[PDB]
Design a protein. Structure first.
Ligand SMILES: *[C@@H]1O[C@H](CO)[C@@H](O[C@@H]2O[C@H](CO)[C@@H](O[C@@H]3O[C@H](CO[C@H]4O[C@H](CO)[C@@H](O)[C@H](O[C@H]5O[C@H](CO)[C@@H](O)[C@H](O)[C@@H]5O[C@H]5O[C@H](CO)[C@@H](O)[C@H](O)[C@@H]5O)[C@@H]4O)[C@@H](O)[C@H](O[C@H]4O[C@H](CO)[C@@H](O)[C@H](O)[C@@H]4O[C@H]4O[C@H](CO)[C@@H](O)[C@H](O)[C@@H]4O)[C@@H]3O)[C@H](O)[C@H]2NC(C)=O)[C@H](O)[C@H]1NC(C)=O
Ligand code: Y23
Ligand code: CA
Ligand code: CA
Ligand code: CL
Ligand code: NA
Ligand code: NA
Ligand code: ZN
Length: 806
């Protein structure tokens, strides 16, 4: 109920919202049909259009005008944006040479450079190059300012999850907006794109930038605009806000454009119809910059031009229907489209069973265009599991495709030619970033980065302390001229023990055997030094990882690898080794086929035992440092130590063995040596964070050996690959993975073929940032390099995507 009896006179686009039933004049009132009767007449004036003309110059002010060309307009801050160009012979901002902005050039009374966020919905990264001819203002922003070739959105690459990530620096699973559409089983309520419940408040977690600004005494324009407010009026309103007195004037502003997403849905990302929407966005940017230039603010304000997601080609004819797979299709609810989420239509259905559903959806058609997942088995890089609103069963849909429940849903509910929502590493989903202003760098290109990082930077640009978030604060320091954030390394919480030889062989009753008992001061002194850490500088290139939680662990040195061995989990937290370009792959000798050796430095009570594996019919074991890469036959005995052993399902051993025997040597020759750190991950509650010991849901049968949910590796080399990994003078280069530790290979449809046809593809799917592995392990890597810490934070957020060029 809005008794829209009040008025909007003197209240047009009021920053503070009003409480029902007093009628609203804020820029969202249209959306809720709750404006004052006079809102259109007073706030959405249009008369005479949007531009000054020669004959309007120095006119007498007429309040019916959309914008003014009179003499006082600059004082009032309500000139048309082209006023000084037409009436004072100035030039359009786009026609000025650019000039480095070394310091803010702001009017008296400005306490900090304002930030204007200019967000565009559906603006695909490749539009920057492909549309460059029809977007001269944006092209000037891009070339004169700081820009990335593209920005990675979060998954799902939908509008609401991404806009709210941009505002909070949080993954959807944490801020709670996990979809454009959602169901919350605890509230028993749905969140809908269109209408009410959207706006209830309880849906939104974290702390968006506008609330962060307010709480710290920085005033915010609104970040929301009704669709019927013309773009030109949006710009004019921001320009007017910028003319307010110092005590009232906001410091952060957002403009939102429904385009080019709106047209891209209809015509596809590159439909011929796409050119005009691109020209119109550019024209709007032109208006903003001319407007700012007029107010003398065009060298004072920081401007971010940013997209939520890209846009892919998708049509009705590329739809997979679950009714082709499931006989029980009426017992399920599907959230459909460029992703799938399935739950039971009825919770009183006790015959509903996710395993049989998953099985009926698994590799059923030769070119099947989606893949089913329990959400905890989704690639960890997607961070899309830890929310009650994300259904247990997820479908990852191929780019260009849709999944639907039944044919009736498509033709009885072809319109569209574009859609988005797909995996966030898909090229067509990538979006844009350009920063322009005194606080950003001049003519600088920066590497691609993830949109979760931006909140921190927008906080830096405003002098704010960001709320706790998923960005890595400092990893975007190289975008900024000043206002950088200089974090310190976290402090090591646990210090390692360095055990020496303290146990006799016969103290071990582990059920293990090894044909090794066949043994000299040349090489007896030598081997002792290897156990003391004499080759450690070769295998621990960047320092040892710091353990960031309370635990008890040992450092174990060997000729070919160094390890940090947990006495709590009975296996290494990490194992580090270097493989040079020249390194040779050997095989496991026959006599050592099932060799496991007791480690005389670690008590039987802190060791694994072979009998548990023998008894455990589903579980086998593998090694973190691969016997295949031993430097000598003598060094190869170290690789069979019980303290290098980890629990592995036979199905996973196929993956791990191919990685260790084939891929590490391959990377070593392609990269000129690599350093590898591998280990286990335990994330049974799928929250993306290291489990404590009481969170482990599975052990090797009859023992206290915990079973990892994942195995990671971090592969580091010199960015300049003419230098060997162990002799690198400058910037590093990394790729990493977090492989699910699974009892079958159902994820890989081709897995009954040779590992050379399927393993590398599975690994690419499960690519990770080192930062992902840090959260999952409580470890902190690259402690001792000669690089700046900010540069190392950038390296740690890098994701190797294996997509071809943008
Ligand atoms: C990405 O960044 C984000 C932000 O940094 C990281 O998320 C944080 O993770 C923290 C550690 O897991 C978590 O800390 C917990 O806080 C609990 C109190 O939570 C409330 O207060 C915070 C602060 O204001 C608030 O943000 C929370 O909001 C959540 O909840 C509502 C919906 O439920 C949403 O509006 C909102 O979106 C957000 O949801 C998300 O977080 C929760 C977890 O908090 C998830 O479950 C949701 O699915 C969703 O993802 C809350 O309003 C506090 O209870 C916790 O403390 C327990 O555990 C500690 C261990 O330290 C123990 O000492 C305590 O005793 C306590 O245990 C007791 O309670 C248990 C639970 O009831 C019970 O089982 C036990 O038996 C004990 O009795 C804990 O400290 C923090 O809330 C979030 N913050 C956010 C914004 O998500 C995120 O991890 C990063 N991701 C990665 C991959 O790095
Ligand atoms: N960088 C950046 C940036 C810019 C703006 C915002 C703010 N914002 C906006 C939307 C939104 C959804 C969520 Cl879950 C959270 C925040 C969100 C929807 C579209 N938006 C509209 O203004 C149309 C409104 C409308 C559409 N139909 C009726 N009204 C903007 C957040 C980040
Ligand atoms: Ca076994
Ligand atoms: Ca966990
Ligand atoms: Cl969705
Ligand atoms: Na023996
Ligand atoms: Na398979
Ligand atoms: Zn869209």
């Amino acid at each position: 109920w809005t008794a829209t009896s009040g008025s909007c006179k003197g209240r047009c686009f009021e920053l503070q919202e009003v409480g029902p039933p007093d009628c609203r004049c804020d820029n969202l009132c249209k959306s809720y049909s709750s404006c004052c009767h006079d809102f259109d007449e007073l706030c959405l004036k249009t008369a005479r259009g949007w531009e000054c003309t020669k004959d309007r110059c120095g006119e007498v002010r007429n309040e019916e005008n959309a914008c003014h060309c009179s003499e006082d307009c600059l004082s009032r801050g309500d000139c048309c944006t082209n006023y000084q160009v037409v009436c004072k012979g100035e030039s359009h901002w786009v026609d000025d040479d650019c000039e480095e902005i070394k310091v803010p050039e702001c009017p008296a009374g400005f306490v900090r450079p304002p930030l204007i966020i200019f967000s565009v919905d559906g603006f695909r990264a490749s539009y920057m190059k492909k549309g460059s001819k029809v977007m001269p203002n944006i092209e000037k922003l891009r070339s004169c300012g700081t820009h990335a070739p593209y920005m990675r959105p979060v998954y799902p690459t939908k509008t609401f999850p991404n806009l709210y990530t941009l505002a909070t620096g949080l993954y959807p699973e944490s801020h709670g907006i996990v979809g454009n559409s959602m169901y919350d089983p605890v509230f028993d309520a749905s969140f809908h794109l269109r209408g009410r419940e959207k706006f209830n408040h309880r849906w939104w977690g974290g702390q968006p930038l506008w609330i962060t600004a307010t709480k710290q005494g920085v005033r915010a324009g609104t970040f929301f605009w009704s669709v019927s407010i013309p773009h030109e009026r949006r710009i004019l309103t921001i320009l007017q806000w910028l003319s307010l007195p110092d005590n009232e004037r906001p410091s952060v502003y957002a403009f939102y454009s429904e385009q080019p997403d709106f047209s891209g849905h209809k015509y596809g990302p590159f439909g011929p119809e796409m050119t005009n929407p691109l020209r119109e966005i550019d024209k709007t940017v032109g208006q903003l910059m001319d407007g700012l230039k007029q107010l003398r603010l065009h060298r004072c304000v920081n401007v971010i031009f940013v997209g939520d997601h890209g846009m892919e080609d998708v049509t009705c004819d590329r739809t997979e229907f679950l009714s082709n797979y499931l006989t029980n299709v009426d017992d399920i609810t599907l959230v459909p489209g460029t992703l799938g989420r399935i739950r039971a239509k009825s919770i009183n259905n006790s015959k509903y069973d996710p395993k049989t559903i998953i099985a009926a959806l698994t590799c059923k058609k030769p070119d099947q265009h989606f893949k089913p997942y329990m959400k905890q088995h989704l690639p960890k890089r997607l961070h899309y599991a830890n929310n009650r609103r994300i259904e247990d069963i997820h479908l990852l849909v191929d780019r260009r495709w849709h999944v639907a429940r039944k044919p009736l849903d498509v033709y009885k509910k072809c319109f569209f030619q574009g859609d988005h929502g797909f995996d966030n590493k898909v090229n067509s989903m990538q979006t844009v970033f350009v920063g322009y202003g005194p606080t950003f760098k001049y003519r600088t290109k920066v590497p691609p980065f993830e949109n979760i990082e931006l909140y921190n930077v927008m906080c830096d640009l405003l002098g704010l302390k960001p709320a706790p978030n998923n960005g890595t604060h400092g990893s975007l320091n190289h975008l900024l001229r000043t206002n950088t954030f200089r974090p310190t390394m976290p402090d090591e919480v646990s210090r390692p023990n360095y055990p020496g030889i303290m146990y006799l062989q016969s103290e071990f009753d582990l059920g293990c055997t090894c044909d090794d008992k066949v043994e000299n001061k040349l090489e007896e002194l030598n081997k002792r030094l290897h156990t003391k850490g004499s080759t450690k500088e070769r295998h621990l290139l960047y320092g040892r990882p710091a353990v960031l939680y309370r635990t008890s662990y040992d450092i174990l040195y060997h000729t070919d690898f160094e390890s940090g061995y947990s006495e709590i989990f009975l296996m290494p937290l990490w194992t580090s080794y270097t493989i040079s370009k020249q390194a040779e792959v050997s095989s496991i000798p026959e006599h050592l086929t099932n060799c496991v050796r007791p480690d005389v430095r670690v008590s039987p009570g802190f060791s694994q035992n072979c009998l548990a594996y023998k008894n455990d019919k589903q579980m086998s074991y593998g090694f973190l440092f691969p016997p295949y890469l031993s430097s000598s036959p003598e060094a190869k005995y170290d690789a069979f130590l019980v303290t290098n052993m980890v629990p592995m399902y036979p199905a996973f051993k196929r993956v791990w063995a191919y990685f260790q025997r084939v891929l590490v040597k391959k990377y070593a020759s392609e990269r000129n040596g690599v350093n590898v750190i591998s280990g286990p991950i335990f994330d049974y509650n799928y929250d993306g964070l290291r489990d404590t010991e009481d969170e482990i849901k599975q052990y090797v049968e009859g023992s206290s050996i915990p079973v990892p949910t994942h195995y990671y590796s971090i592969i580091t080399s010199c960015l300049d690959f003419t230098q060997p990994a162990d002799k690198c003078d400058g910037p590093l280069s990394v790729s990493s993975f977090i492989l699910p530790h699974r009892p079958d290979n159902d994820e890989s449809c081709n897995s009954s073929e040779d590992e050379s046809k399927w393993v590398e593809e599975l690994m690419k799917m499960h690519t990770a940032r080192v930062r992902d592995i840090e959260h999952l392990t409580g470890l902190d890597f690259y402690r001792k390099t000669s690089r700046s810490y900010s540069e190392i934070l950038t390296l740690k957020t890098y994701l190797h995507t294996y997509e071809s060029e943008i």
